[PDB]
Amino acid sequence: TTGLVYDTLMLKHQCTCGSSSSHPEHAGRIQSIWSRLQETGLRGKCECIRGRKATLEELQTVHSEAHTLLYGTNPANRQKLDSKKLLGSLASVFVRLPCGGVGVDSDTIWNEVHSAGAARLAVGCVVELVFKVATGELKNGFAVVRPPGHHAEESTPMGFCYFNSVAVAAKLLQQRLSVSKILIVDWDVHHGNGTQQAFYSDPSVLYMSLHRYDDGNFFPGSGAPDEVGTGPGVGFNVNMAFTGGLDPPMGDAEYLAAFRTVVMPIASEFAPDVVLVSSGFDAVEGHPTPLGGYNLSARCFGYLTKQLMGLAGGRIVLALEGGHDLTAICDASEACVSALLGNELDPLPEKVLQQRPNANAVRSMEKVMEIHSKYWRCLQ
Ligand SMILES: O=C(NO)[C@@H]1[C@H](c2ccccc2)[C@H]1c1ccc(-c2cnco2)cc1
Ligand code: NA
Ligand code: NA
Ligand SMILES: [Zn+2]
Ligand SMILES: [Zn+2]
Secondary structure: EEEEEHHHHHHHHOOOOOOHHHOOOOHHHHHHHHHHHHHOOOHHOOOOOOOOOOOOOOOOOOOOOHHHEEEEHEEEEEEEEOOOOOOOHHHOEEOOOOOOEEOOOOOOOOOOOHHHHHHHHHHHHHHHHHHHOOOOOOEEEEOOOOOOOOOOOOOEEEEEEEEEOOHHHHHHHHHHHOOOOOOEEEOOOOOHHHHHHOOOOOOOEEEEEEOHHHHOOOOOOOOOOOOOOOOOHOOEEEEEOOOOOOOOOOOHHHHHHHHHHHHHHHHHHOOOOOOEEEOOOEEEEEOOOOOOOOOOOOHHHHHHEEEHHHHHHHHHOEEEEEOOOOHHHHHHHHHHHHHHHHOOOOOOOHHHHHHOOOOOHHHHHHHHHHHHHOOOOOOO
């Protein structure tokens, strides 16, 4: 049986300027996905679980105390709980954004009444779902959550992320269940700099990201192929980094090629007990060159989901990260839940299924393969 998680309190994370048109990561993203699953009958076939807020203890597996006080509490308790006197003056943390609202860095917003709650419910929702699948109470699941997580570093929010929901899930799985091997696949078009950071030296967690890299200036500018891990973790960080720009743009042929030749062989060798997926949908057609640039179909994510479902005895959980375009993210979410439920994949055209990946795609794949050939038998 497939699980779903969602909570309407996540809608309340909204800029104080009162206008979501200045802020791409907006409440409507989840709301629409949520109704799409209703109007297709998919929600009816799933178990919808009860979310909760993450405790500060739970957030502190990934993030510092200072950071968890700053973004996990309302202002009154923020003083109450900072007995260690870690925080300086809030005067220096808050700035006025170009839209007139309150934020923290030049891009990222902050609502003092609602964002802390919302950021913590996003984590707690994922955690609840992940643990329910890991203990075998559910087959698999999809976490329709907001705000996103994978850019949140130990002590820095960025890319509209405040806490790394998926990282925390994983850490809790280690600490409270002693799960031996965890796989995190991050197919959001942007690199998950936070997640990479959180497990770079840990060989019991393998992080694989497919993302646009282009020689280091695509956001967030981390995630190079030769970043492979450190210490005992060497080899358990796989950056499937696409280089060459948008000439031509990457699409279904390219991604399916990378799965077959890089992601799935390595994942199979690792043979993980649980699979977590940072499931951003910004790689889909309809994401302009700043936000995306690539041309995947939503359908395609059905194929990617199905492939991952073969691992870990099916114990797979997808959590929303990026993806802006409403049609795209609803279509893609449709495909994935449909896959998780067990339905036959709504296919791609034979024209595509026979397409050789572009020169850039191939070159990008061969560089990763050469590097990780040192660490994985299936690449020799
Ligand atoms: O997709 C994403 N993360 O995975 C990131 C945010 C996102 C998430 C969800 C919905 C919409 C957007 C998008 C982002 C892209 C570029 C910059 C940027 C550009 N120049 C400096 O910083 C900042 C944020
Ligand atoms: Na990624
Ligand atoms: Na690792
Ligand atoms: Zn604003
Ligand atoms: Zn993204």
